[PDB]
Amino acid sequence: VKKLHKLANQTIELLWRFFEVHISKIVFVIIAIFIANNINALYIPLVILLSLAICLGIFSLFMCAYLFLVALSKMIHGNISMPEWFGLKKEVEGTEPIYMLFGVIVSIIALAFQSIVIYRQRHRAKVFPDFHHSHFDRSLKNAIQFLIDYGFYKFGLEITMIAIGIDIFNRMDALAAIQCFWLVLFALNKRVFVRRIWVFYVIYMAILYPLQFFSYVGLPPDSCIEYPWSYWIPSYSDDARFNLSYLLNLSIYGVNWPSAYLIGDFFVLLLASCQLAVFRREGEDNDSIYNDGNFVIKPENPQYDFIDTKKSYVDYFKSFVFHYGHWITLMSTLAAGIAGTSLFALGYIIFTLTMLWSGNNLYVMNSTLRSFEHTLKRWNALLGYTLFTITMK
Amino acid sequence: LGMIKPDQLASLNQALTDSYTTRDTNSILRSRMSVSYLKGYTYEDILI
Amino acid sequence: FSKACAVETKEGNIGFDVIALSFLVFQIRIFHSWYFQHCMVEYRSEVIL
């Protein structure tokens, strides 16, 4: 009984510590899902103000009142009229005003959840205040704490790149083309270049998001005007024009934009915001050890050996990930090459065979003649070829 | 009343095997099933 | 014309290439990280010498 009560108290304390830093993200995700459910015209101010808030307690009450206004509003060439295009569809009288609206009133409580913690705190940014990464391999619990606390400070650039890649995968348009061009620019440079260019990239995409949503919502139906982009094509059928409009992501009458694009760009927004938040507190951990300019082994390292003293299982995990990781990545790239059917597949095949043919003799730092520098040059060539393949596709 | 001539059976087989579109996946299965069912009977087991 | 050239069904996807890119970017990031100098020390003089 007492042990169960203590466990319950520990669980509620840890979930409260999770909430006091994750309620903002949770409510943002919920609002994004809700606005993906309803993509009508009147959602412009709210997406604009959420984008401004992500870009930057004065902003905490901006959306609190507007959702009440939405709740106030929800209680209130052709083939459609003004109220339906606005987002106010006159439902069947006598059925219900709250027929399918069971989250907006909950969203008000969600804003209260974000507000009660703010009010009671001012009347540190870590769930675990006794964290220590010096000997994270001495306990599996400490390894979990490392994964949950510095798991993003360690690899935030990588997870942002993964988010961009999945956005390209689920995007497949000219926006995907500019995204992969940005990916090519980012992946072929050192840390200083992204240090300088990330602010420009994030402001460009933050400005682009509202314009994307304006393109999504479109134009009023009874505007007595036709989109110019509907008559560029001189001598091809209307389906070709529709395909051209869809690929360039321009508004068209009677469009049914799926929510996958909005989900992807919302996750891009959140990943960029987290990356910038950790980017302000920059240090020396996320810096390459090759800045000195030589390939010789560093005489003294700030970490102990892991190949020996195999104790517990996290040491085994490090050994597996650091000793045979290249085998796993070569397996993945060979599977990707064999999956496709093109000359790019042949390039993947030949590059992976010539990479695997140099097993261990080429992994030697003996001065010159294809040393560690040449190995990294070959790996950078692999990056270049992969980005060329994706951008060409 | 008589057995189907091989020319008519061949023409019917060609018409059945060329009846699909290159967009929808389910039409492939329908055409395959129709061709497989037709191939179960030779020109001697079909009459007109 | 689509019948003549006859693409298989739709296969021009951008899939497994993405996860391959993920794995290789992770590997190249590890190549510029810690514990890897110790890894190559284990490779050198315990496999050949």
UniProtKB/Swiss-Prot annotation, chain B:
Q: Where in the cell is it found?
A: Cell membrane
Phenotype seen when the gene is deleted = Reduced brood size due to defects in ovulation with incomplete constriction of the sheath cells impairing oocyte transit, an accumulation of ooplasm in the uterus as a result of 'crushed' oocytes, caused by incomplete opening of the spermathecal-uterine valve, which in wild-type allows the fertilized oocyte to be expelled into the uterus, and sperm navigation defects.
Domain of life (superkingdom) = Eukaryota
State which tissues express it: Expressed in the pharyngeal-intestinal and spermathecal-uterine valves and in multiple reproductive tissues including the germline, somatic oviduct, and spermatheca. During reproduction, it is expressed in sheath cells, sperm, both spermathecal valves and the spermathecal bag cells.
Q: What does this protein do?
A: Pore-forming subunit of a mechanosensitive non-specific cation channel. Generates currents characterized by a linear current-voltage relationship. Plays a role in reproduction by positively regulating inter-tissue signaling to promote oocyte maturation, ovulation and fertilization, and sperm navigation from and to the spermatheca. May play a role in regulating cytosolic and endoplasmic reticulum calcium ion release.
What more the UniProt record tells us is: Piezo comes from the Greek 'piesi' meaning pressure.
Q: Which family does it belong to?
A: Belongs to the PIEZO (TC 1.A.75) family.
| The protein's name in its UniProt record | Piezo-type mechanosensitive ion channel component 1
Q: Which organism is it from?
A: Caenorhabditis elegans
From Swiss-Prot, chain C:
Which residue ranges does UniProt annotate as crossing the membrane?
Answer: 14-34
The places in or outside the cell where this protein is found are:
Cell membrane
Gene disruption: observed consequences? Reduced brood size due to defects in ovulation with incomplete constriction of the sheath cells impairing oocyte transit, an accumulation of ooplasm in the uterus as a result of 'crushed' oocytes, caused by incomplete opening of the spermathecal-uterine valve, which in wild-type allows the fertilized oocyte to be expelled into the uterus, and sperm navigation defects.
Q: What tissues is it present in?
A: Expressed in the pharyngeal-intestinal and spermathecal-uterine valves and in multiple reproductive tissues including the germline, somatic oviduct, and spermatheca. During reproduction, it is expressed in sheath cells, sperm, both spermathecal valves and the spermathecal bag cells.
Superkingdom of this protein's organism: Eukaryota
The function of this protein is: Pore-forming subunit of a mechanosensitive non-specific cation channel. Generates currents characterized by a linear current-voltage relationship. Plays a role in reproduction by positively regulating inter-tissue signaling to promote oocyte maturation, ovulation and fertilization, and sperm navigation from and to the spermatheca. May play a role in regulating cytosolic and endoplasmic reticulum calcium ion release.
Q: What is this protein called?
A: Piezo-type mechanosensitive ion channel component 1
Organism, by scientific name, is: Caenorhabditis elegans
Provide the taxonomic classification: Eukaryota, Metazoa, Ecdysozoa, Nematoda, Chromadorea
Which part of the complete sequence is present? 1287 to 1335 of 2442
